[PDB]
Paper text:
VP24, one of only eight proteins encoded by ebolaviruses, functions in virus replication and assembly, and is thought to contribute to immune suppression by binding to a certain class of molecules called karyopherins to prevent them from transporting a transcription factor termed STAT1. In addition to its role in interferon antagonism, ebolavirus VP24 has also been proposed to associate with membranes, and is important for assembly and function of the viral ribonucleoprotein complex (RNP), where VP24 binds to the viral nucleoprotein NP. VP24 adopts a compact, single domain, α/β structure of novel fold (DaliLite v.3). The overall shape of VP24 resembles a triangular pyramid of dimensions 73 Å×30 Å×30 Å.
In order to provide 3D templates for understanding VP24 and its many roles in immune evasion, replication and assembly, we crystallized VP24 from Sudan virus (two versions crystallized: SUDV1–233 and SUDV11–233) and Reston virus (one version crystallized: RESTV11–237). We subsequently determined structures of SUDV1–233 and RESTV11–237 by molecular replacement, both at 2.0 Å resolution. The exception is RESTV, which appears to be non-pathogenic in humans, although it remains pathogenic to non-human primates. However, microarray analyses have shown that RESTV has a reduced ability to suppress host immune responses. Crystal structures presented here include VP24 from an ebolavirus that is pathogenic to humans (Sudan virus; SUDV) and VP24 from an ebolavirus that thus far, appears nonpathogenic to humans (Reston virus; RESTV), although it is lethal to nonhuman primates. The overall folds of SUDV and RESTV VP24 are similar, as expected (r.m.s.d. of 0.81 Å; also see Figure S2b for structural alignment). The entrance to the hydrophobic cavity (11 Å wide) appears to be gated by two residues (Y172 and M71) that point away from each other in RESTV VP24 but toward each other in SUDV VP24, appearing to block the hydrophobic cavity. Mapping of sequence differences between RESTV and the major pathogenic ebolaviruses (SUDV and EBOV) onto the RESTV11–237 structure indicates that RESTV VP24 differs in ∼30 sites. One of these sites, a cluster of residues L136, R139 and S140 (in RESTV), is next to the 142–146 loop, which is important for binding karyopherin α1. A second site is the cluster of residues L107, H109, T116 and G120 that exists within the 106–121 polypeptide that exhibits decreased H/D exchange in complex with STAT11–683 and may serve as a STAT1 binding site. Residues in VP24 that are unique to RESTV often colocalize with residues that appear to be important for karyopherin and STAT1 binding, or are important for virulence in rodents through an unknown mechanism.
Numbering used by the authors:
A (entry chain B): 15 to 61, 70 to 108, 113 to 203, 216 to 231
B (entry chain A): 10 to 62, 70 to 203, 217 to 231
The structure:
């Protein structure tokens, strides 16, 4: 029983990052993601008419470009928030989501035992299948000339709003109530589609 | 003050590779190893136990007409298949890699014991477990499962229907049948893994 809990905790409460020749490989919840390093370049450069579509990002002194890793973390947090829309485990999902969203630590700490007692393979399996579903929901999106309703997903915590938008440059990701944003290349999700 | 990033990573990789986590479900078992989930059916043992006392009985007399063969669980079959995939991997590399020692030890553990935790106390090998290594392992296991999936069911004109992996110490044979994969180990033990376990990876 200690065994299962520890195995699950190792996978769910650590967000591993390793540098590769292409960018980074990330490992979380037993899923690998390859994150390309191309990104900050284009975004910071245009700070390609996508610019005009997002003036609040590219023409705003109070916007902050984040790394592609940040973009992935935000997306995973969003997937979790998306499962959250569905009770004692609800708080665990909440805490892990919060940790992914708002911190940059690679290891989830507080509150160790509380959350840990709820961890199981069944729960991790649900988390993984829901994450893959959310990814395919992102993949379902259409790149569209204008803003449009059909090219983005929005999830809204009590303390944050996450917008993920599919563009010609890949997945533009933004977090608001100031604004933080980044870009995740579509390649990161290619293995799951 | 707190374990460096590399030490947390090594711990996580150790936990994924050295725990074979087995849980009961309504359909059989769900196994978790190397960050990979497998749904294993508990069924099929009756068939085997009957045959052991057709074309199948004579096709595998060492299993079915041998009072000294021993039927194992499907979990054992999966363990043997994973062990075999690791041997397959380690044969493509050279001893000069930490990955070789690890693949070997993990494979021996999965293949020859039933324990669900592998007490790896060679600091040497543990200190070289990495996300790169685990990634290579996962890649190769899925590649191996795809080689198994592309086997034809044993047939009249000898279309490739099995894979054999030989160690200094064991011989592992995995054969495609109408009932899924018949797995055997000789130095005889055998079982059957229903093919649904591999369906998600096709």
């Amino acid at each position: 029983k200690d065994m299962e809990k520890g195995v699950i905790f190792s996978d769910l409460c650590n967000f591993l990052i390793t540098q590769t020749l292409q960018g980074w490989k990330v490992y979380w919840a037993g899923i690998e993601f390859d994150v390309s390093q191309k990104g900050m370049a284009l975004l910071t450069r245009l700070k390609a008419m996508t610019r005009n579509l997002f003036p609040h990002l590219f023409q705003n002194p109070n916007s902050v470009i984040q790394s592609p890793i940040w973009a992935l973390r935000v997306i995973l947090a969003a997937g979790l928030q998306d499962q959250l829309l569905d009770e004692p485990l609800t708080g665990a999902l909440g805490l892990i989501s919060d940790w992914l969203l708002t911190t940059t630590s690679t290891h989830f700490n507080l509150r160790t035992r509380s959350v840990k007692d709820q961890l199981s393979l069944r729960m991790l399996s649900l988390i993984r299948s829901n994450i893959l579903q959310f990814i395919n929901k992102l993949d379902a999106l259409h790149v569209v000339n204008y803003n449009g309703l059909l090219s983005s997903i929005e999830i809204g915590t009590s303390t944050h709003t996450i917008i993920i938008t599919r563009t010609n440059m890949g997945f533009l990701v933004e977090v608001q109530e100031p604004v933080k944003f980044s870009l995740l290349h579509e390649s990161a999700f290619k293995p799951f589609t």
